[PDB]
Structure 1
Amino acid sequence: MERFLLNSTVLLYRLSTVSLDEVSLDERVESSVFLAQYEQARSLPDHVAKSAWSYLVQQIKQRNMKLGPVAILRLIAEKFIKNEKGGPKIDLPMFSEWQTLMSRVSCLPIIACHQVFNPGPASQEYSFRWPLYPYHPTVEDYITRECLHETHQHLNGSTSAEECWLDALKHPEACLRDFEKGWASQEMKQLCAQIDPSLTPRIFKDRLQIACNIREILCRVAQGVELPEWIASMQNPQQLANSTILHNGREYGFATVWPIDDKYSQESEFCWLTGLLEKWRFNAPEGLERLLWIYLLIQNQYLTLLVQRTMTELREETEKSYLSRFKHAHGAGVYSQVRYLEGRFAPKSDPNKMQKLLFSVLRGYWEYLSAHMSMEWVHEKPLTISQVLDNLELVEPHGKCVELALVPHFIKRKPKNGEAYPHALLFKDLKNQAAILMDMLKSEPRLTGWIRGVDAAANEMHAPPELFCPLFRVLAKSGIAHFTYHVGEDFPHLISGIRSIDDALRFLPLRNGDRLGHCTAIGITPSIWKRSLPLSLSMTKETRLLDLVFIWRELRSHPELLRYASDAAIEAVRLAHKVFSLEEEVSITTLDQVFEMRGLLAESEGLSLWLEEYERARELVKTTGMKRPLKLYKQWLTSDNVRKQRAEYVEVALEYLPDEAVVALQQAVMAKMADRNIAIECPPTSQYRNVSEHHIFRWMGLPGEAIEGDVPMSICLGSDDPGIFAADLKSEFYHLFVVLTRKFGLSPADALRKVAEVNENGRIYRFHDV
């Protein structure tokens, strides 16, 4: 429960609102804790909270200390972090729980408290490194031998959330600008209201600047410098909502001097916090400790809102952040811990911005390499992308350092109210971006060795994959090997997700060894897919009809489900009749022929490198006996009536199909996949009670999770956990190892090689040049 006292919206209000000399807020802190649990962990049975709080307070009073940041952090550090071998580490049994706490709290304060109150041997000068980790010699030797391989880094640009808070403190105005530009959006209305009811942009700025001011003041006291006299005027936290304080007539600026150049550096934060805590080892002023309360609380609230969520992204268009990611990916040892890194990046609409971003990333990689290996760099200070390449070709794949592969994102937005065919404007945008990419490759053909493969991300329902097939094929002929597309992550229905996955398979120009993405649909079981959700699910008519045709096709060969297959046939015919407003009798067969054309470009022939696909409809139209498919698909694309019908909603009864049938669909899907030799990135991520049910294990063949009709699926790794701070690929590696060893009782060797197949598959299906 401790992480309440560090992450609490109501406590944040109360502490920020009460005066600094109030004292004796124990009851209200406790009540705020109970409200926080009621909001967050509703399931706790109303008495565990009171008991655990009686404890927490009891331990505090035993240790003769005050309810404080230092108190809670001390308890947490003592409970979790141990110093072993090298640096602080996380106990193997407690690692998962520590991750759960990470899902709510920042670890820098905890780490500083650990160092100050129980430092390890005074022989290894420790430098801050996030996140903290457990130790297993087998795992360590394995990583030393083979290193790790990143393929899914797209959660928040390419960095952890923690440094973004410091970036905010560095450009508070930029973050307010982004906050506001988006405050006009609907979705974030609900996001912000549900995280913090009365969040609002003015209070956004107020909390940000208050945090800046508290950091400054606490830094002054940590350095132990004179407690400036306007502190006396400082009485109410709301005073920290302004850039200057008024003591008597004068407006005093809080700005001050810090030893380090990068005043917003994580290292600066850490040194500051260590100094403060060591000053505060025996006792603390109440005003300042409450200040640190609100400081940590605002940190955490900001970090959540960010994680549960373009210009705060643009500011990362320098060769500083990329160097940072690269240095972090490289360990503290001479050899980098990750062997092969996939660098995923959002394309822009302007050639200037793409060339800027590309030069930034390329240069940063060059400096990362130069900082580790010495040689004649030709252009010692490269200024152009061509110069950077000139520098880079000289590198050989020894493996001392990481190997970079660059993948642009394809962001799928919702269709708009008015357009010739669905997603037409989005298609135009993507065509613009892709053409620019192609032209940059034209200009610098050597870029084919660094820009390898394109991913298709953002919310799936906003666009079906068939929209991207012409894009992917044109890019391929441009020289883009390898492709990726997010499938199966979220869906109106599990059958819908499975159908979407097969659509991608059968339509996308995916070759041997390509990689799809989460594909959670074919991993999640129908036992654990419906546990708190309504018995029926409303969804779009188009989605329903496509899924019904999918059920048809997949179950046509299954003797045990032919009843369901006939039902799918009948109901798909009826839905087609309604959506297309049909009066003639239309066969499931011709529906199927219509639906197999979904990969065709809208504007091909029914509506340089684009000529092939522009004519791709020509041989189809040449096929005489496909009249009805042509006209029906043209109606599907253009007809206003058909489009409104497609948008229409209607229920699916949950138990439309037996879970056995769902599993059969899944298994047909894995069969087709494995036939085509495609891999599945699986990052650890809503409905799972604990990680133990993660479908990764079913894909991994664990007894008690795997199903009889199952296959291997070439799972690969990816460091993208939506609801955590300061996560890493090796963090996920350790997560999987510990869960295997503990919950499944596998011996350390067993867990090691279990995870190792997925890791080495990461290398195997790397897109990087060979």
Structure 2
Amino acid sequence: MERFLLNSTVLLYRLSTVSLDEVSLDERVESSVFLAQYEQARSLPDHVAKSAWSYLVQQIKQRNMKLGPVAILRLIAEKFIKNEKGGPKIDLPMFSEWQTLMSRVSCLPIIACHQVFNPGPASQEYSFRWPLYPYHPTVEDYITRECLHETHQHLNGSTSAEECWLDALKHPEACLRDFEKGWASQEMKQLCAQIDPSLTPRIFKDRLQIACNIREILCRVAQGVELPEWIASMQNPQQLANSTILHNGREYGFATVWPIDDKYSQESEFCWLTGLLEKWRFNAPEGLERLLWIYLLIQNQYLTLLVQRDDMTELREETEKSYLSRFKHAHGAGVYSQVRYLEGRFAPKSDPNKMQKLLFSVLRGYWEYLSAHMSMEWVHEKPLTISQVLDNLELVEPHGKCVELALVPHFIKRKPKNGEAYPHALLFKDLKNQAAILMDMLKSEPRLTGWIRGVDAAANEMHAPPELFCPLFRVLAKSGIAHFTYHVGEDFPHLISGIRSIDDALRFLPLRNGDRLGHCTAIGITPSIWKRSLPLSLSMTKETRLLDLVFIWRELRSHPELLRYASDAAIEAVRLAHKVFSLEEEVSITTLDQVFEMRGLLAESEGLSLWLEEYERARELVKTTGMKRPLKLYKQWLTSDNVRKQRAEYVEVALEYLPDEAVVALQQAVMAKMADRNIAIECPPTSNTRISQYRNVSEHHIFRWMGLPGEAIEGDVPMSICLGSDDPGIFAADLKSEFYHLFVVLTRKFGLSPADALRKVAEVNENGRIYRFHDV
């Protein structure tokens, strides 16, 4: 019930619109908790929620406290945080629930409450920058010996959501413009309405202003200075939405003086809350206590909005400082970095000048991190340019006590616009342009090949198929990129479609030995779990259905137990192809296979500088053999309006079109291809629950990949799995947190020994070192 109190749109609305004169809101807060509980967790029974609320109220009453943010934070701090040899830690049994709580509530008020009421031993100096972790001697010993390796680290944005919230307070206008820019899209409107139906940019401005004003008022309370007496006119919380209070006809401001020069820093945020909670140890004024409650609710709702949206001026506000903070966060506390190999992902920019500034800022921040930790001779104390930064960076030797940085830009796929010859034309031109700036820069600075180590494509799978990036990747390979990773968007209309998508990526993309694929959930999730809460029939496009049909026939045409399914797939695929192509001749399943074999060829090459050489190479390889009828069919597949109209048409496919054994066989066939090609998998953090079929962390497919008994299916081919913390789905997270989360689940729910659990997690962690993109 604590998470509902600290995160509820209904409670925030009922607290931000009601005047502070009222003091007895227990009934209405209770109603808010029940409404939030039903909205967020409907599967929870009503009587269980009522009993939990009754226990919570009794617990507060027995502690001589009052229902509010202070009491709730105190109960959470005792429930989760205790003091150990390394400072404040999280109980190993309680870490899984803590991660679930971190998806809804920010931890900074909780740790501040813990410091106030349960201080560390001997009053030793303590600083809260990194998220809290549990402690196990085996895990700490392994981390100190073998540092953690990150394969997917988005360098854009901030390390966590909480300092993003402070950034929003620091620059309300910049975040407001970004919010409105996203809000114009319909997806953001739906997402905001899901979180809060009564959410508008006007209300967003009001809530941001109210939270900032509450911060200033409570800063005066926490600092110890007396209130400036305009609080008498302060009766309604909505008066803080305009950044000025009218008292006796005078316009009074809200900002005050802060001891730290950075009033929006993490340390200022922690110090303010610790002081405010210390002064409210025994009692608090009701109006100001509600003000703290409103601030926490506004902050938590903003953090939820940010994390769900994640998966110019604002960028220039931090620039190299954000990257420097990222590398310090990856380093962690102590002289020795907890992370050795870190692969940074950044969004490519079509502007060459913006690109040069972007990589200069990232590389300069990396040099700043190295110079702060390592004291050595530098060629340029103030490089101010990429060339001098590389001059300083080339003096650094691989020693393992610091973070080793590899840069992998991730191309962003977009929606396929109507017409425009082949379906993905404008998107391909944009990606080709972005590659062009990347290539001309690499030839303009050959030393950048030692830092620009890979190319990624992570937007979504429906918008662009894997065969789109094949000419892009092949031409980029000749530019010295030397590594390629492709994100398989796991929003497949059918499980077979996702398995086909991974197979298509292996078939067409030029993934060499040691390459990686991103988020291969389709071959990881079992059919039984995937079918949870799904309609008995599923909808997908004719193009996707036809491709899945050919894939099913190819994999299963020999399986004696599954010759039903392959023969049926081949027959009905031929019948579907007759509708899609509108052809009148006879087409066998073999001919359909050949047409889909040449999918990787460029559209212009199919119709027929590094780019041109790839053009005739694909063109000649389509003409060496004596068949042009499949080539003609592929031309009709690409550049026929009737075919495109048929392709975009949706068909109705049953949920259990193939039995679970058949789908598992397809997954294992792709497993064999994945292992034979030696391609690693960047597993998402297990705390990220966008799958929506996993009702607990123990049901995650990584444990099936780990070969756990009960989880692994007979016939599964072992694969290389890496740890990638790109979108953790929780406010405060780290690669260490994911490492501990996997260890905790293995030890507790699966009942593994600490050594055995460490061995399995270490194997996954070391796969990020074996399959790293860093230059050797």
Classify the TM-score, shorter chain.
Answer: over 0.9
Alpha carbons of structure 1 residues 316 and 453: separation in structure 2 relative to 1, 3 Å: farther
SS of corresponding position for 1:521 = coil
Give the CA deviation at 1:183.
1.6
Give the CA deviation at 1:488.
5.4
Tell me the alpha carbon deviations over residues 495-516 of structure 1, each in whole angstroms, 9 at most, x when there is no partner: 0000010100010101101000
CA distance in 2, matches of 1:350, 1:657: 48
CA distance in 1, matches of 2:762, 2:317: 33
SS of corresponding position for 1:293 = helix
Give the CA deviation at 1:245.
0.8
Give the CA deviation at 1:647.
0.4
Q: Which moved more, 1:606-615 or 1:374-383?
A: 606-615
Give the CA deviation at 1:626.
1.8
Aligned residues: CA RMSD = 1.3
CA distance in 2, matches of 1:155, 1:576: 44
Give the CA deviation at 1:617.
3.2
Structure 1 runs not aligned, ≥5 long: none
Alpha carbons of structure 1 residues 512 and 287: separation in structure 2 relative to 1, 3 Å: same
Alpha carbons of structure 1 residues 607 and 9: separation in structure 2 relative to 1, 3 Å: farther
Alpha carbons of structure 1 residues 91 and 679: separation in structure 2 relative to 1, 3 Å: same
Tell me the alpha carbon deviations over residues 521-571 of structure 1, each in whole angstroms, 9 at most, x when there is no partner: 000001111111101111000000001000011112211111111111111
Give the CA deviation at 1:170.
0.9
CA distance in 2, matches of 1:155, 1:551: 39
CA contact (8 A) 2:331 2:339 kept: yes
Tell me the alpha carbon deviations over residues 621-650 of structure 1, each in whole angstroms, 9 at most, x when there is no partner: 423532211111111111111001100001
Q: Which moved more, 1:120-129 or 1:669-678?
A: 120-129
Give the CA deviation at 1:722.
4.4
CA contact (8 A) 2:130 2:332 kept: no
Q: Which moved more, 1:579-588 or 1:202-211?
A: 579-588
Give the CA deviation at 1:620.
3.4
Give the CA deviation at 1:152.
1.7
How many residue pairs get aligned? The number is 769
The yes-or-no answer on 1:733 pairing with 2:739 is: yes
SS of corresponding position for 1:622 = coil
CA distance in 1, matches of 2:659, 2:261: 63
CA distance in 2, matches of 1:557, 1:157: 50
Give the CA deviation at 1:575.
1.1
CA distance in 1, matches of 2:111, 2:67: 19
CA distance in 2, matches of 1:345, 1:338: 19
Other-structure match for 2:511 = 510
CA distance in 1, matches of 2:317, 2:230: 37
SS of corresponding position for 1:316 = helix
Give the CA deviation at 1:315.
3.4
Tell me the alpha carbon deviations over residues 739-763 of structure 1, each in whole angstroms, 9 at most, x when there is no partner: 0000111110010111000111111
CA contact (8 A) 2:192 2:199 kept: yes
Other-structure match for 1:765 = 771
Give the CA deviation at 1:313.
6.0
Tell me the alpha carbon deviations over residues 313-366 of structure 1, each in whole angstroms, 9 at most, x when there is no partner: 633661100000111111211000001001000001100110011000000000
CA distance in 2, matches of 1:610, 1:100: 48
Alpha carbons of structure 1 residues 167 and 158: separation in structure 2 relative to 1, 3 Å: closer
CA distance in 2, matches of 1:587, 1:313: 56
CA contact (8 A) 1:68 1:289 kept: yes
Alpha carbons of structure 1 residues 283 and 456: separation in structure 2 relative to 1, 3 Å: same
Give the CA deviation at 1:96.
0.1
Tell me the alpha carbon deviations over residues 555-599 of structure 1, each in whole angstroms, 9 at most, x when there is no partner: 122111111111111111111111111111111111111101111
CA contact (8 A) 1:161 1:725 kept: yes
Give the CA deviation at 1:411.
0.7
Alpha carbons of structure 1 residues 302 and 636: separation in structure 2 relative to 1, 3 Å: same
CA contact (8 A) 2:606 2:634 kept: no
CA distance in 2, matches of 1:741, 1:302: 34
SS of corresponding position for 2:153 = coil
CA contact (8 A) 2:608 2:619 kept: no
CA distance in 1, matches of 2:721, 2:24: 55
SS of corresponding position for 1:522 = coil
Alpha carbons of structure 1 residues 89 and 417: separation in structure 2 relative to 1, 3 Å: same
Alpha carbons of structure 1 residues 392 and 443: separation in structure 2 relative to 1, 3 Å: same
CA distance in 1, matches of 2:559, 2:240: 69
Q: Which moved more, 1:745-754 or 1:619-628?
A: 619-628
CA distance in 2, matches of 1:590, 1:158: 51
CA contact (8 A) 1:600 1:616 kept: no
Alpha carbons of structure 1 residues 468 and 313: separation in structure 2 relative to 1, 3 Å: farther
The yes-or-no answer on 1:253 pairing with 2:253 is: yes
Q: Which moved more, 1:1-10 or 1:606-615?
A: 606-615
Give the CA deviation at 1:156.
6.7
Runs of 4+ in 1 over 3 A off after TM superposition: 154-158
Structure 2 runs not aligned, ≥5 long: 688-692
SS of corresponding position for 2:45 = coil
CA distance in 1, matches of 2:145, 2:32: 49
Alignment of 1:421-570 (within 5 A): 421-487=422-488, 489-570=490-571
CA contact (8 A) 1:175 1:312 kept: no
Give the CA deviation at 1:131.
1.1
SS of corresponding position for 1:520 = coil
Give the CA deviation at 1:231.
1.5
CA contact (8 A) 1:667 1:709 kept: yes
Alpha carbons of structure 1 residues 567 and 155: separation in structure 2 relative to 1, 3 Å: farther
CA contact (8 A) 2:606 2:631 kept: no
Tell me the alpha carbon deviations over residues 366-398 of structure 1, each in whole angstroms, 9 at most, x when there is no partner: 000000111111100110010110110000001
Alpha carbons of structure 1 residues 313 and 577: separation in structure 2 relative to 1, 3 Å: farther
Tell me the alpha carbon deviations over residues 197-243 of structure 1, each in whole angstroms, 9 at most, x when there is no partner: 10100000000011110011100110011101112111111000002
Q: Which moved more, 1:402-411 or 1:230-239?
A: 230-239
CA contact (8 A) 1:317 1:360 kept: no
The TM-score normalised by the length of structure 1 is 0.98
Give the CA deviation at 1:89.
0.2
Tell me the alpha carbon deviations over residues 95-123 of structure 1, each in whole angstroms, 9 at most, x when there is no partner: 00000100100000000000000101135
The TM-score normalised by the length of structure 2 is 0.98
CA distance in 2, matches of 1:624, 1:336: 56
CA distance in 1, matches of 2:651, 2:606: 33
Alignment of 1:353-752 (within 5 A): 353-487=354-488, 489-604=490-605, 606=607, 608-623=609-624, 625-685=626-686, 687-752=693-758
Tell me the alpha carbon deviations over residues 702-732 of structure 1, each in whole angstroms, 9 at most, x when there is no partner: 0011011011100010113442111111100
CA distance in 1, matches of 2:677, 2:317: 38
Q: Which moved more, 1:717-726 or 1:635-644?
A: 717-726
SS of corresponding position for 1:460 = coil
Alpha carbons of structure 1 residues 96 and 324: separation in structure 2 relative to 1, 3 Å: same
